[PDB]
Amino acid sequence: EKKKKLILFDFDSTLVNNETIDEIAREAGVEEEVKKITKEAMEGKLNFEQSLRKRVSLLKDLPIEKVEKAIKRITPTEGAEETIKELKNRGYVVAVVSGGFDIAVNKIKEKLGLDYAFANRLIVKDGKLTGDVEGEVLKENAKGEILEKIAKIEGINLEDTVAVGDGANDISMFKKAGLKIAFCAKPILKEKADICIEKRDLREILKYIK
């Protein structure tokens, strides 16, 4: 026998190298403005939901074909698939929980073979973004609520959970997690982490997890 563990990964800047919202902002012509808000939000200087709605509103009217062009530029972080496969090899459950968007996160869930995926969604009308976003990964304690929910479904004690992220919206996930790993993270999350990894290779987390 042997117990399973549950590992939750943030998406933007953690499982992938990019910030989905910033990539889309480039196609919408508001890259500078959105990048600045994203940085403040991930450093913990802004309420997450308010900052995300402010950024998504700047994307109003962008055609879906341009959103896809931005998504195409997203690349997986070094070692991502190998790390996920090794965790699954141990019999562990793996999830991605993101303040980003299904249109990007759906793909990685299937590509890397994840068991769960939670993200927000961009609202679309007549083939263009309306500027609205909706979802359950918006409130300040959203990720922690999701970690608890998944752990309950799987019968896994919170002490056997691991959270891996880079930004301030990963703090609520860290609060409930058994092991807190800040991956090439912002100072506000590093302060709360058990382990800080600065080499950009997800395989580095494996050493800390039995």
Ligand SMILES: [Mg+2]
């Ligand atoms: Mg992130």
